[PDB]
């Protein structure tokens, strides 16, 4: 009786939101950006190849200096690379080799990683002893760790396969805030540039916008037909892009609270693993299961170019803070650095 | 490299590269095994001599100059197809089925079919274990095998009843390149390490033959 009545009210609320979004859907992003000229063909060459991982690379993250990057592989090794020289700065042996994510702190003093061990491990890079040591192991998730991102040296946000995201106080080792509401495994998260909000994509084919300080879900974004594997904020923080197993990328707007554009091709039938934006946001780079990385025109939904330099899945990618280069990691155990030439 | 500090930085990088190869060579000498089965199918005590080294439980032991790493993924209640590709490079899969539980018998059959025909385990062999065969023989008297398998029409003897269950699992394999190593074991059996070692040795030879170019 009471349960049946309440679940009917939820359907009415869902229709109210759907009608509200349709009311403000006066135009389409495709129509708005029809007049602007295309970006042309984007040609990028492999400037660097980072060799030394002996297993599938699962994650990479640039440091804020746009020169150092950290990559994680299931050979049980965290490696920090000097991308200019291809020198290995550090090699961190992981206690658990089943790593799925890695993050570089914006200060450059810490890196984080974690996987099927349900733990986010914090590593101190600047010690008087001259070696990298574990500083914290964040326990509390009951599923695998899928993504992690530092807010500062003391706070980090983690998404897990137990359908929840958490905000952690690294110094105390306790999760100050727990973000609940996803009905499937949360596979990725992206921080807003001001680090006041973050979006997460789960296996319920939905993206939720969370307030870090308040600790509740502000908005929910649907439209994908399969599990979301990747998510990335637009450089101004007013939009984000997702990648799913349905071979599509969608651009959602925070303020319009709806999808604006879909990035899919008929030839593409494989899942998407990673998404990122260029510094101006005009390019959307997505890694695919078909061993390729497709560069999309964010405004016009045109495939600008292809990065074909891997013999297995492109598992991760990232663009430097200065926008100079893009790194692609792959299951073939190699990292490649790409940029164009005049 | 030109600078004095860059030369030492390059030397540090080379020292790191050397240790990565040494670790990788030692890592490739381990036999990694993925342990699967029902919720209670005897996978916890599949080997007596093995010792543990919500998350993934890794168990390791050494048998006849061969190091075996057994990974139990039963603690992961999340979606399996989001993390099952992490074991794509597994040497073999150990699948445990309890013959004394008819309610979970059909659960194992559909679990076996998905793993056997998984896109990441096409060329991965399976070491099927049918545990509690002594309890199955004792319980086959009062409870016929037709309760769990209505289509079963063979004799009710213990030898044929166990063989019919084994043939049900091997029928799930649709790839001729995959080899399934079935074994009937008891609760008090203490030679399961030998059965795994014999099955892994056959798999290694097939891998070696591919490595030496004969295949």
């Amino acid at each position: 009786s009471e349960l049946d009545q309440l679940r009917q009210e939820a359907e009415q609320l869902k229709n109210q939101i759907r009608d509200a979004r349709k009311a403000c859907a006066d135009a389409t992003l495709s129509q708005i950006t029809n007049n602007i000229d295309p970006v042309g063909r984007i040609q990028m060459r492999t400037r660097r190849t980072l060799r030394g991982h002996l297993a599938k690379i699962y994650a990479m993250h640039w440091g804020t200096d746009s020169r150092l990057l950290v990559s994680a592989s299931q050979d049980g090794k965290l490696i920090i690379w000097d991308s200019y020289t291809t020198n290995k700065v550090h090699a961190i042996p992981l206690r658990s080799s089943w790593v799925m994510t890695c993050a570089y702190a914006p200060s450059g003093n810490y890196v984080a990683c974690g996987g099927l061990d349900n733990i986010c491990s914090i590593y101190n890079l600047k010690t008087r002893e001259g070696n990298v040591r574990v500083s914290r192991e964040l326990a509390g998730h009951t599923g695998y760790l899928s993504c992690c991102r530092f807010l500062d040296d003391n706070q980090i946000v983690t998404s897990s396969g137990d359908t929840t995201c958490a905000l952690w106080d690294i110094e105390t080792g306790q999760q100050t805030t727990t973000f609940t509401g996803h009905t499937g495994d949360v596979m990725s998260l992206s921080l807003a540039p001001d680090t006041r909000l973050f979006v997460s994509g789960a296996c319920d084919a939905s993206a939720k916008l969370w307030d870090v300080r308040e600790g509740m879900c502000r908005q929910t974004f649907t439209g994908h037909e399969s599990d979301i594997n990747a998510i990335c904020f637009f450089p101004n923080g007013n939009a984000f892009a997702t990648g799913s197993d349905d071979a599509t990328c969608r651009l959602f707007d925070l303020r319009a609270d709806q999808e604006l554009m879909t990035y899919s091709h008929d030839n593409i039938i494989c899942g998407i693993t990673s998404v990122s934006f260029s510094k101006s946001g005009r390019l959307l780079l997505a890694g695919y299961d078909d061993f390729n990385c497709n560069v999309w025109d964010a405004l016009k939904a045109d495939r600008a170019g292809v990065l074909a330099g891997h013999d297995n899945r492109v598992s991760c990618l990232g663009v430097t803070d200065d926008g100079m280069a893009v790194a692609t990691g792959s299951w073939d155990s190699f990292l490649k650095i790409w940029n164009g030439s005049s | 490299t030109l600078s004095a500090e860059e030369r030492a930085a390059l030397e540090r990088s080379k020292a790191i590269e050397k240790n990565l190869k040494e670790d990788g060579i030692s890592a490739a000498k381990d036999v990694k095994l993925l342990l699967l089965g029902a919720d209670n199918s005897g996978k916890s005590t599949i080997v007596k001599q093995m010792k543990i080294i919500t998350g993934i439980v890794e168990t390791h032991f050494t048998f006849k100059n061969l190091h075996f790493r057994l990974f139990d993924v039963g603690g992961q209640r999340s979606e399996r197809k989001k993390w099952i590709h992490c074991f794509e490079d597994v040497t073999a899969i150990i699948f445990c089925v309890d013959l004394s539980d008819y309610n979970r018998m059909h659960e194992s059959l559909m679990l076996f079919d998905s793993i056997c025909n998984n896109k990441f385990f096409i060329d991965t062999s399976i070491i099927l274990f049918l545990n509690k065969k002594d309890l199955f023989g004792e319980k086959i008297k009062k409870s016929p095998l037709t309760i769990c398998f209505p289509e079963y029409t063979g004799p009710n003897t213990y030898e044929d009843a166990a063989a019919y269950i084994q043939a049900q699992f091997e029928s799930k394999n649709r790839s001729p390149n995959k080899e399934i190593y079935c074994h009937m074991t008891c609760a008090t059996d203490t030679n399961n390490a030998q059965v795994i070692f014999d099955a892994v040795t056959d798999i290694i030879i097939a891998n070696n033959l591919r490595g030496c170019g004969l295949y």
Partner: single-chain antibody
Amino acid sequence: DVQLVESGGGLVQPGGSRKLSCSASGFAFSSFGMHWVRQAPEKGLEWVAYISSGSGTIYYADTVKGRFTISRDDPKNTLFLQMTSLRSEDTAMYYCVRSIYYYGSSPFDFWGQGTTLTVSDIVMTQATSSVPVTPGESVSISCRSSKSLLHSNGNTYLYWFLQRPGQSPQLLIYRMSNLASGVPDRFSGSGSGTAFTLTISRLEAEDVGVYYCMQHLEYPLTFGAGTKLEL
């Protein structure tokens, strides 16, 4: 805590041999390159030798090459300096210095207490030998080099050290602008090409001492004469 204890020094006869030891505790010794730096009484610092991490690279100063041998024992965390044919020119306090080299590292960050031995090339210039200073006032120290210390990679391999009276040298500024760990922000390093300035805003009692500028552009590493601050 990070420690570097030297031993084996003492009064030796001319033409003799002596073995200096540097025991390391509290840090990953095998990860650090090691230097021997000596300081003649009432004189500036003089670099002696260098052995890299992993013992693959070894450098000596010309004045000691062929007579001194530098070695390390990584399992025992001990650094050695075997000296032969000791001359009266070798009478100095010998310091054990750790230095690790990777992108963004701070070489020469920790120095040992030193051991005293008594026997019976880019030119770095610090023309101002002494500078009278008062607490709370800003002080600038100048250093010059015969060659440009700016490398094509953008780094300027100039270092600043402070040796307080009775204490071992401490790193202040590495690569001409970066501030060493544990150093107050009042110290600032500024330079261009061959001319460099160390500015000390709001001078305090602890800042009193001798300041040395060292170049690490190439071997042999050379020190300036040193500028002393006095009240």
